[PDB]
Amino acid sequence: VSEAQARRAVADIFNSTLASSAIGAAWELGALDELRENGKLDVSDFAVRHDLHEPAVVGMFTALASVGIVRREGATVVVGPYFDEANHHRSLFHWLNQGSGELFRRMPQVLPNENRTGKFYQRDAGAISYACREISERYFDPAFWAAVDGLGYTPTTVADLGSGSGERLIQIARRFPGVRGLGVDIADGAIAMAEKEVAAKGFGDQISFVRGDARTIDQVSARGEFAEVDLLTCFMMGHDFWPRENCVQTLRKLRAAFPNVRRFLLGDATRTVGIPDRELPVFTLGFEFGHDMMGVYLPTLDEWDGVFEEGGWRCVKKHAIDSLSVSVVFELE
Amino acid sequence: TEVSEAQARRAVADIFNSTLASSAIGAAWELGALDELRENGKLDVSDFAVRHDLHEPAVVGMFTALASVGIVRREGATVVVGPYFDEANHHRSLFHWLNQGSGELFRRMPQVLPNENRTGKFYQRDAGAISYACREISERYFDPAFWAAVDGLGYTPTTVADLGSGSGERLIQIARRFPGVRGLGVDIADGAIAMAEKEVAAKGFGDQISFVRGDARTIDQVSARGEFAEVDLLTCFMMGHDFWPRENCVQTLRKLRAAFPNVRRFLLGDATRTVGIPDRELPVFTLGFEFGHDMMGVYLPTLDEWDGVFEEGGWRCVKKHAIDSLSVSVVFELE
Ligand SMILES: Nc1ncnc2c1ncn2[C@@H]1O[C@H](CSCC[C@H](N)C(=O)O)[C@@H](O)[C@H]1O
Ligand SMILES: Nc1ncnc2c1ncn2[C@@H]1O[C@H](CSCC[C@H](N)C(=O)O)[C@@H](O)[C@H]1O
Ligand SMILES: C[C@@H](C(=O)C(=O)O)c1ccccc1
Ligand SMILES: C[C@@H](C(=O)C(=O)O)c1ccccc1
Ligand SMILES: O=C(O)[C@H](O)Cc1ccccc1
Ligand SMILES: O=C(O)[C@H](O)Cc1ccccc1
Ligand SMILES: [Ca+2]
Ligand SMILES: [Ca+2]
Ligand SMILES: [Ca+2]
Ligand SMILES: [Ca+2]
Ligand SMILES: [Ca+2]
Ligand SMILES: [Fe+3]
Ligand SMILES: [Fe+3]
Known about the structure:
S-adenosyl-L-methionine (chain A); 10 strands; binds (2R)-2-hydroxy-3-phenylpropanoic acid; binds (3R)-2-oxo-3-phenylbutanoic acid; binds S-adenosyl-L-homocysteine; about 50% helix; EC 2.1.1.281 (chain A); 2 domains; 15 helices; binds calcium ion; Arc Repressor Mutant, subunit A; homodimer; WH-like_DNA-bd_sf (chain A); alpha/beta; about 15% strand
């Protein structure tokens, strides 16, 4: 209410922007892990160990300090009041900023209808793939590995739709050493990352990747390899199949393109309903706003339940995900 | 713990949403939303989206982002001003500068910090966007101090040079107040030059004002040397820090002195590096200004550092003006 209160709050919003960006960068540059492990670090030492521009490192930590993630004491950076929560959700900040920053930055050019043709926004596919690797482990894994443990069979060939970093295929190969893996992704930067990772991790002879549009799966260049697939996975792009009639038809095409698939594991975030503006939790606003900016439909959880049957699949189990807006894993059959 | 974990949970959610609101402040400024709201206190969302032909779902998101931190409130079909509207709107150009102008620098922090990457063109910002924001930053924060100094020149300028001319608006405004004055803007960015050419055309000053892409740090290789001898007022707003470190600044200032022999008054306005502000009491702008320039490798002097440079640079400081609410910003009157 007061003029002093408004001044602080606006300063906080301004500083939050820099802290937000610094969260994913601090994660990526290794500082969050060190803070988590030791509770404190020495800025100069850190900058020297990691060969970083020290004046910028000071600002990074200052940014974090400005909103209570961290607390500076002389030459020392110490864990702050909000560190565990921020560190828990760090990959969502990375997704927001390092991954998706160019979308949100260009709001004034992306909103006007006359600009909304062809490629009217840009994001960093590799940075998204990187963040999503942790989003997956942090939020979706317990459900994913529960679904994998409940398969009732040992997969031999697995296909992953919107494969990103390729980590899901690697993980399935670590679990089922005989398995062959095929990832489909529409993004060059994703394919590039994934091929690097399977090479580096020793899986190049077991896992391959094709650039293609899972929405039009029957057009994809790897047609002949789909007949041997007996496990299908799709995480964090289901909403891209929408709106509803498109999703139904894509699901029918997947059923037919993948005739030997027994189980199809599908994980995604969904659109929320009725959350107060002042009570929006982490991620939700960015997820929803980002996709509305991109002109991409986001179904609610309710809308998903309705499409599987017409899509030619039976939903056998459904898992709630903790604290990633409203997210879900479906086990389909 | 229970109500404490709830607190940390809402704090971190507020940081995330603030990122979105922050970007929306500049965007809503640019799209005309902030000005409508200041003028009427209220607007109809669908009617706004139609009048400006904007994608309505995205418009709703934009206003949702601003409401999520208290800048506006959504009621039915309507958006109204929130508790923090006046303050955020007051500083709207600073948010635009942070996001629309400089967002690409801050986004690439994990690639900018490593020393191995810090050569050549290791970051990118939006010069045009910066020029646009700076036009309001000048008018809203620097103008009172600027026009007081212009008032006190003791003369009518005949040719003015503006170092880091950006949008061209200072030169335009001096030309409004001093009819038939001549003007020359130097800027190192074509995005500023482009905006400035467009603005002087449109306001019918192409007659009297010209622009050249050059580096004011090395004024003798600025290739509009022909006009310099005639210049009798020098101005330089929001780029003095670029002259540093100290040795470079001393040399540039001396060069300015000799490059512009007929200059009487040199009005120098800039933000400076602060010292000792506690991390949780940083006012708006300060952190972005300092962190940004540290990321770019650009020296930021304190107010004292400037005070100690002028005599060696060939200049006498005769008057200093404090600026309200732009970190620690100042205008020096030099002679
Ligand atoms: N129509 C489409 N066809 C194929 N891939 C798509 C697609 N739309 C989006 N994608 C990809 O889906 C990915 C979403 S991010 C999820 C990455 C990965 N599944 C993981 O769980 O970590 C991105 O890499 C994006 O490029
Ligand atoms: N070495 C250099 N030489 C010339 N211009 C420079 C420069 N370094 C930065 N600039 C310019 O200085 C400007 C600072 S922004 C301020 C613009 C304008 N003076 C105003 O009052 O609104 C930018 O347009 C930037 O491109
Ligand atoms: C990858 C991201 C997403 O949909 C996008 O970047 O377009 C996403 C999906 C689901 C949960 C978290 C992030
Ligand atoms: C334009 C900006 C700046 O230095 C920059 O973008 O590099 C600035 C300088 C001084 C006051 C406000 C903004
Ligand atoms: O309707 C649902 O909730 C999901 O589509 C999957 C499911 C359906 C029935 C029983 C269990 C799971
Ligand atoms: O030294 C200073 O503080 C200013 O740089 C200029 C100034 C000097 C003396 C009297 C007034 C102004
Ligand atoms: Ca990008
Ligand atoms: Ca096996
Ligand atoms: Ca295709
Ligand atoms: Ca109304
Ligand atoms: Ca002093
Ligand atoms: Fe998406
Ligand atoms: Fe600068």
